UniProtKB/Swiss-Prot annotation, chain A:
Organism name: Desulfocurvibacter africanus (Desulfovibrio africanus)
Lineage: Bacteria, Pseudomonadati, Thermodesulfobacteriota, Desulfovibrionia, Desulfovibrionales
GO cellular component: cytoplasm
Protein name: Pyruvate:ferredoxin oxidoreductase
Region (Disordered): 1196-1231
Disulfide pattern: 1194-1211
Curated annotation (Swiss-Prot), chain D:
Domain of life assignment: Bacteria
Cell location: Cytoplasm
Full protein stretch here: 1110 to 1232 of 1232
Comp. bias intervals (Polar residues): 107-116
Disulfide bonds listed in the record: 86-103
Organism: Desulfocurvibacter africanus
Name of the protein described by the UniProt record: Pyruvate:ferredoxin oxidoreductase
Biological role stated in the UniProt entry: Catalyzes the ferredoxin-dependent oxidative decarboxylation of pyruvate. Required for the transfer of electrons from pyruvate to ferredoxin. Ferredoxin I and ferredoxin II, which are single 4Fe-4S cluster ferredoxins are the most effective electron carriers of POR.
Family affiliation: Belongs to the pyruvate:ferredoxin/flavodoxin oxidoreductase family.
Region listing for Disordered, in residue ranges: 88-123
Swiss-Prot record, chain E:
Organism encoding this protein: Desulfocurvibacter africanus
Known partners and oligomeric status: Homodimer.
Source organism, top-level taxon: Bacteria
Protein name, per record: Pyruvate:ferredoxin oxidoreductase
Membership in a protein family: Belongs to the pyruvate:ferredoxin/flavodoxin oxidoreductase family.
Range covered out of full length: 310 to 371 of 1232
Secretion signal span: none
Compartments, as annotated in UniProt: Cytoplasm
Function in brief: Catalyzes the ferredoxin-dependent oxidative decarboxylation of pyruvate. Required for the transfer of electrons from pyruvate to ferredoxin. Ferredoxin I and ferredoxin II, which are single 4Fe-4S cluster ferredoxins are the most effective electron carriers of POR.
């Protein structure tokens, strides 16, 4: 039978998908990843599908690969499913045509997510699923967590009986990550609904050599059209089949559905047609408004394809005079969005009454669709009746938006308690909120709903939880805007965010802070808050969560205290039961290590309940003195755009605020100064050997070396301690290691590697450091950076260069950013970056924080994110542009040399042409040209003067993670490197798909634990470097900052200067690897990665062969035997040891064996005497010739495929045999 | 001036595409192959485009690779074109959203060909071009060998001035391979129709470390929707621009 | 043994034996082959070919290398050799043939081989 | 034993006739004789080197193990299971049903650094 | 739409929209859907709109 459960849309549908499928081909993409991961976990735990078998799941190299495997699996007679979204669904489109064209019962579960256009978005809308509406797949929408479960089941059953593949979809995040208490069917009940005759027919018609057939033929005009129409019967019947299964499932669950469902006044005059989670919020509003006499209604679209106009009309009240169709997408240039056009077709074909039909757009990229907005929509139908409108934004550019009145009354059912929790990443708030949802749902008749807003910031980010509990079903698919309970778990928020926004009168406000004394509170708590607390007679509670946690021994960990606060003050449960339930569950969870860690939590609760007293505030708060604006100076863009966004007001920025093409300017992160490190380094100048390694190693550019001349230190603060500069070249300069304490993330890598025993860097609390260092860094930032003093590519020298990628949203201690920071210090001013989607694009450019910046001269990396799969080709394109445009420039130069241009100009041109591709010479002469041709606007010299941004040789780089490089973009990477063109590929190998949640990649090593390799990966790590080296003309190298910063810089210079393709693979530490002693040990782990032989460093340089020397050089020494401790020092390996000690020992021994073999192979490579060495290049010369020119026999066929304008000449088509055979037959036949 | 010649839809189109482009990323697929092969042979023969430059053409590993290259070339300031159809066009779809989304003057010449479903067909119909109707590309059809030449030119001129990528298409075989005596314009005539200011502007806004910007950001619910609607003013001007160039 | 089950279970329609009797087209171990040209294997389908080979599963890939995209009209591919004339290689290809074989051999667990009927039918 | 085996012999020197016997090569000789001559010589050298490399592969005593499969056994484990510091971030991308539990997010420095700060700030 | 109507004769009583494609399960093919929407938004006269499919895979259209 049934079973109650609180879960999200994802697990609700994965629950059914696992039961109904035998095979699944998958690939990770947010927000669908959860489904595949749960399927893998369940299969590993032993869960059986309806056939008593565990699922056969496999991760492909991309969604295109999964789609092909799904097709093959179905073709070969196995029920198959997949989970995907957005960009991924797009890659599956070609196979969708094949899967439906071949009438295969496949089922795709899609979490509708936005497609990347002017920008990428992981959030929800229907752009992706609408992009596939013509593939022939049936499309069934579910609008709630409970509907996801039901529709997933209907889709599968219907796909099996109808033979038409189905795409079951639900809104990304809004439905996929929303938690609800729902009911799910047993697998046995699902099995009982399966049409057995159909299943057997599927099996019998499938591919099998015992009774073969041919599929995928190529057809000519004589029969293609007929063959395409032969499936009609099937599409005509699918609708009735879907209704039939909606009915059968209803007899088991009690929840009925129709292809189109209607809710609202039966005599409604104004109706809305919508699809997805929006239907839930719309219905809630209808209940509220209809109860006031409003004649409104809603038609919920279930089956979107095939579109059965008859079922649409069955749901349409004849009284409707105005109908608004809501589309959750945007098709630029179309006369209207999909659903709108479908509805219009229904009315014209019916050819009768024509009510006013309006089209409306909403919810792009999970944009809120709230009750107020629904009111706007309904008001519009009785008022202006604006058409093709937008709602949810202010379109002050084209004026397509409906105005929205946010005073609209709360419409949640009577008796709904709404909660909001403001937490700090990793403080356990979300996990506590989820527990409270399970606890409450399992122990009451209350409906529970939870949704979570996260931060683009991976570290120290803010989280906002929205929970609702009630006696009536919760249809609020929108954030809480009028909360009964608001908890602010981080005191730093009090003064920076509008935390009490919309909280109800007499509402409860809990704050975690050490401001126990009325004087303390008055001191820290701002006025706006005080006035709000006072004027709304809010039950304000304060609690030093940090002091209690410490006191009971929980070491300042606040989750349990704030959890107790919720259970005690939220008012969803009675004091007794709540405290009881909370405790019972504490023994439930925990209980693992003795009752000692159980007592501390039990105690923490007891103490919390006691300390949880209603803070009393003076009635004078009613009008506290509004404070001033002690805000520093910044950009107009940071003031008008990013600041508003960073403080949760982006929703108020109108369209006029953004660039039509989605671009953002560089360096907006320079002003964020979040200051979230708990501990920051403290420079101890007495111990400093002035090496600059600390700045080189910082993942966030938080360390600023200073090299000043006496005169520059004049107004220097008293505490701006500077050492006399060590070094022959620095004789006379003052040196300083200035810590940027607000941008520091407090990872500790710098301090960890600082050379001297008596450390020159020591971690101290942020407070003990800011007052002194904030003004100091601000003074230093104004001291010219001495880039001309030392070699740009020397360890010390590089840090005397301007880093052009700073303060990114990467995790504290991230292993990727140090590498990227250094590269900019070496080529930043003349580079192009084609960045593959991934962590690097995420910390690289999450609006509105832009970490890449320009130097003092305005130059900086031209950075761009195309897609996840095409970074290499994207960069290759940029390289094609430069080739074309710089060749055009060269041609103008050469022409100008043969004109009456002045001797100076001519000398400069000649110099540029000669040094065209040299960074030093091209800039030297190009710079003379900007001067000489300044002002020239006419003729040849004019064109040349207008092409100055093309004078100095550019550096095209392609940045990407291992998932990009070894998997999805490998084919493109391989082709680009094989092109022999001058591009630079930098691969940050984290040995997993990091950004998406640690999924295994072909770069994942043997024995490593990761998603889809949860028992340890059972295939060795793909050898991308050795594969690329077979080309012979591509520069290939490996690096590891921790092992050698010099070898890294050497590699950087040699790769970039190579006049061909370059590939550099770097070892990148990541939080997913689980470094046991913290990410601050990254540099040391990189060091060990190399020494252990786990990550050998080498270089393959084709130009050495061009001079009789071996292109391959080993840069590290043989395995030193430390691999075992290197692996055990990472949880990705250690967990397997604790869980499967037997197989883990074996897998770690295999790694040591593989690396030992590999090192030995690299050794003969370096010892070899055989290698590719001929001519550098040469050739060309205008002219083309066709491979068929002058052939003795036909060189092309009779096919339409080879027909060309010039083809058609008579030729010997090889039907008379060899030239000799014909000759001999000629002789023999003489006559 | 004008010039009488007897050729097919493919060549009539490629004749214009070569003249109006600086860069091309290609991949072979019937019935559009002729165009790319032609553009390649002409480049190797030294034919000059309207800028007196021979075309920079490279063959990718697939159409997806080709489309990514086209996106990159456009992003970096070069006028770019590509030739495709059917299955190839489908693989270009992800990039089409990015190309129209960043408002780039790209021009795709497509020989409309059927999509492989119950079977593969190299023949003509609009299944492929309809599959890309929501990518944001303007779509201009030519129904005859003579129109292929004219629309190809309108498409290029209109893309440059409007900043909206264009998909110029004609029927696979029925037009791409039909031979007709028609009139083509000299490259000089085409060059004189080009909006020199729009062109300079396209180059000034392109990617360049000398005056950088960030493109392809990742955006949250707070601003994505507004950002997607910001291009409306460009799509509103497209119709007028096409009509102007037709005239 | 599968052929013996076909005779022993002929007629079985009920229970376990019936279910087994209905699965005879699965008794004999099958041979899964993947056919394709060099354009597929060295270019467009390379990433999937690579991924599938790395999977370690039991499949057989047979590549008919014509050193060009033949069907479409002789366009060059990464399998096209140095100096060979083909569309997009109008003055003879200026990059050498991609070594697909040596690239795949780097896994160590994939069986790789090259053949040429004209030289040895036995090999 | 060595997995790699060479089935043909060292170049016999007839490569030039081989190429010239095919129009894809000969046509270049007739149109760009100088470049053709260069490229055919480049091919001859490329194969010379390749064969020599295949001969080393065949004569090497350096190679790795092999086993079809086995081991894993029922059960799986999350890579974050019992880690000392957070293994996931504050991103909606890494969010999962079971995530949300407090952990050391690496903003307080290393274990050792944290430990030494405790020792020093004791009080 | 404005340009579409500038081309439609006011005398037109029946209009057939020909689509050279097939979208299985769609209430209509693309061009047809676009034209229907044109008439619906105009709000005036509603001639009979007919949808027809032709020319798939180069099928003759004589
Ligand atoms: C944002 C987006 O949708 C990301 S982030 C990226 C992670 C890749 O990891 P890689 O190892 O290359 O780099 P890392 O994160 O540094 O480890 C993936 C799988 N995708 C999801 C995804 C899936 N499939 C496709 C076609 N496109 C996208 N964008
Ligand atoms: C008929 C069809 O559309 C063929 S025939 C094939 C030639 C492949 O050559 P390969 O060397 O792999 O094999 P060969 O012919 O035996 O030499 C191509 C390029 N395609 C065209 C093509 C292009 N791009 C995409 C995505 N799909 C297809 N089907
Ligand atoms: S602790 Fe980490 S973020 Fe802070 S200055 Fe040191 S390396 Fe940079
Ligand atoms: S790592 Fe230490 S010794 Fe080196 S420059 Fe930095 S503070 Fe000084
Ligand atoms: S690579 Fe790892 S450590 Fe760096 S930002 Fe990504 S998840 Fe964080
Ligand atoms: Ca290079
Ligand atoms: Mg990675
Ligand atoms: Mg071939």
């Amino acid at each position: 039978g049934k079973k109650m459960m609180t879960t999200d849309g994802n697990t609700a549908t994965a629950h059914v998908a696992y039961a109904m499928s035998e095979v699944a081909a998958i690939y990770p993409i947010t927000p669908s990843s959860t489904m595949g991961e749960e399927a893998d976990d369940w299969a590993a735990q032993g869960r059986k599908n309806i056939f008593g078998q565990t699922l056969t799941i496999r991760e492909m190299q991309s969604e295109a690969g999964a789609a092909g495997a799904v097709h093959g699996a179905l073709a070969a007679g196995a029920l198959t499913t997949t989970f995907t979204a957005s960009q991924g669904l797009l890659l599956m489109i070609p196979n969708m045509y094949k899967i439906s064209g071949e009438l295969l019962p496949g089922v795709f579960h899609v979490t509708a997510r936005a497609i990347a256009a002017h920008a990428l978005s992981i959030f929800g809308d229907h752009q992706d699923i609408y992009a596939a509406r013509q593939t022939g797949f049936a499309m069934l929408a579910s609008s709630s967590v409970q509907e996801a479960h039901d529709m997933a089941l209907v889709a599968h059953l219907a796909a099996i009986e109808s033979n038409v593949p189905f795409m079951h979809f639900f809104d990304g995040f809004r439905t996929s990550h929303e938690i609800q208490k729902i009911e799910v069917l047993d697998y046995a009940d699902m099995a009982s609904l399966v049409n057995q005759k159909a299943l057997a027919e599927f099996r019998a018609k499938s591919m099998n050599p015992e009774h073969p057939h041919v599929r995928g033929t190529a057809q000519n005009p004589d029969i293609y059209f007929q063959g395409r129409e032969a499936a009609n019967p099937y599409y005509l019947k699918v609708p009735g089949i879907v209704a039939e299964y909606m009915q059968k499932v209803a007899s088991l669950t009690g929840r009925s559905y129709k292809l189109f469902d209607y809710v609202g006044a039966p005599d409604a005059e104004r109706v809305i047609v919508s699809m997805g989670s929006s239907c839930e919020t719309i219905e809630e509003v209808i209940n509220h408004l209809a109860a006031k006499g409003e004649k409104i209604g809603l038609i919920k679209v279930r089956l979107y394809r095939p579109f059965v106009s008859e079922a649409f009309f069955a749901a349409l009240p004849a009284s409707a005079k105005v109908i608004t169709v809501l589309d959750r997408t945007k098709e630029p240039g179309a006369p209207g969005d999909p659903l709108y056009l479908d509805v219009c077709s229904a009315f014209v074909e019916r050819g009768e009454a024509m009510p006013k039909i309006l089209a409306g757009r909403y919810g792009l990229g999970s944009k809120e669709f709230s009750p107020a907005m629904v009111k706007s929509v309904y008001d519009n139908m009785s008022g202006a009746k604006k058409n093709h409108f937008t709602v949810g934004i202010e379109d002050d550019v084209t004026g397509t938006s409906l105005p929205v009145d946010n005073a609209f009354a709360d419409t949640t059912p009577k008796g709904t308690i709404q909660c909001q929790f403001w937490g700090l990443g990793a403080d356990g708030t979300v996990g506590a909120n989820k527990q409270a949802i399970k606890i409450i749902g399992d122990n009451t008749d209350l409906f529970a709903q939870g949704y979570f807003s996260y931060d683009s910031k991976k570290s120290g980010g803010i989280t906002i939880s929205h929970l609702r509990f009630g006696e009536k079903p919760i249809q609020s698919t929108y954030l809480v805007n009028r909360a009964d309970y608001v908890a602010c778990h981080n005191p730093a928020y009090v003064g920076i965010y509008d935390i009490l926004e919309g909280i109800k009168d007499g509402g409860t406000f809990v704050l975690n802070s050490p401001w126990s004394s009325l004087e303390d509170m008055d001191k820290h708590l701002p006025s706006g808050i005080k006035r709000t607390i006072a004027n709304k007679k809010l039950k304000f509670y304060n609690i030093d969560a940090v002091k209690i946690a410490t006191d009971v021994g929980l070491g300042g960990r606040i989750n349990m205290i704030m959890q107790t606060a919720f259970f005690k003050l939220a008012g969803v449960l009675p004091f007794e039961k709540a405290v009881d339930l909370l405790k019972k569950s504490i023994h439930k969870a925990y209980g693992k290590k003795g009752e000692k860690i159980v007592k501390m939590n039990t105690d923490a609760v007891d103490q919390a309940v006691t300390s949880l007293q209603e803070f009393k505030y003076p009635d004078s708060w009613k009008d506290a003195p509004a404070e001033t604006k002690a805000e520093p100076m910044t950009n107009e863009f940071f003031k008008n755009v990013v600041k508003p966004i960073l403080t949760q007001q982006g929703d108020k920025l109108p369209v006029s605020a953004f660039e039509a093409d989605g671009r953002f300017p560089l360096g907006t992160s320079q002003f964020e100064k979040r200051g979230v490190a708990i501990n920051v380094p403290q420079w101890v100048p007495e111990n400093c050997i002035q090496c600059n390694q600390c700045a080189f190693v910082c993942p966030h550019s938080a360390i600023l070396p200073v090299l000043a001349k006496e005169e520059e230190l004049v107004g220097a603060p008293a505490n701006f301690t500077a050492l006399e500069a060590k070094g022959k070249e620095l004789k006379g300069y003052k040196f300083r290691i200035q810590i940027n304490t607000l941008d520091c993330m407090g990872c500790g890598n710098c301090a960890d590697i600082c050379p001297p025993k008596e450390k020159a860097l020591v971690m101290q609390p942020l407070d003990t450091q800011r007052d002194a260092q904030v003004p100091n860094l601000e003074y230093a930032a104004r001291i010219p950076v001495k880039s001309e003093v030392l070699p740009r590519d020397s360890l010390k020298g590089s840090q005397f260069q301007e880093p052009l990628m700073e303060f990114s949203g990467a995790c504290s201690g991230c292993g990727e950013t140090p590498y990227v920071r250094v590269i900019t210090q070496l080529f930043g001013e003349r580079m192009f970056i084609a960045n593959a989607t991934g962590c690097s694009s995420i910390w690289g450019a999450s609006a509105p924080s832009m970490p890449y910046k320009t130097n003092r001269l305005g130059q900086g990396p031209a950075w761009g994110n195309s897609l996840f799969e095409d970074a290499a080709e994207y960069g290759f394109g940029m390289n094609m542009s430069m080739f074309a445009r710089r060749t055009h420039l060269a041609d103008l130069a050469a022409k100008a040399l043969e004109s009456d241009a002045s001797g100076d100009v001519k000398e400069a041109l000649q110099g540029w042409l000669a040094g065209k591709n040299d960074p030093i010479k091209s800039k030297e002469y190009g710079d003379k040209l900007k001067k000489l041709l300044a002002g020239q606007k006419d003729g040849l010299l004019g064109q040349i003067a207008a092409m100055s941004d093309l004078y100095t040789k550019k550096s095209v780089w392609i940045f990407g993670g291992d998932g990009w490089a070894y998997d999805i973009g490998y084919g493109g990477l391989d082709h680009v490197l094989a092109s022999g063109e001058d591009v630079n590929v930098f691969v940050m190998d984290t040995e997993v798909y990091s950004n998406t949640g640690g999924q295994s990649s072909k770069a994942t090593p043997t024995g490593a634990v990761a998603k889809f390799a949860a028992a340890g990966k059972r295939t060795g790590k793909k050898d991308l470097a050795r594969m690329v080296m077979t080309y012979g003309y591509v520069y290939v190298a490996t690096v590891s900052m921790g092992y050698s910063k010099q070898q890294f810089l050497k590699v950087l210079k040699e790769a970039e200067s190579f006049p061909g393709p370059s590939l550099v693979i770097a070892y990148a530490t990541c939080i997913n690897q689980g470094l046991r002693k913290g990410m601050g040990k990254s540099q040391d782990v990189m060091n060990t990665a190399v020494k252990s032989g786990y990550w050998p460093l080498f270089r393959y340089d084709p130009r050495l062969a061009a001079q009789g020397k071996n292109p391959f050089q080993l840069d590290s020494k043989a395995p030193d035997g430390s691999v075992e401790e290197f692996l055990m020092a990472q949880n990705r390996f250690a967990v397997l040891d604790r869980s499967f000690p037997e197989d883990a020992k074996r897998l770690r021994a295999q790694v040591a064996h593989e690396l030992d073999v590999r090192f030995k192979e690299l050794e003969h490579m370096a010892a070899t005497n055989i290698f590719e060495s001929f001519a550098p290049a040469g050739g060309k010369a205008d002219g083309s010739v066709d491979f068929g020119e002058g052939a003795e026999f036909c060189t092309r066929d009779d096919t339409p495929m080879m027909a060309r304008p010039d083809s058609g000449e008579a030729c010997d088509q090889n039907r008379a045999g060899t030239s000799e055979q014909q000759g001999d037959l000629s002789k023999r036949t003489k006559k």
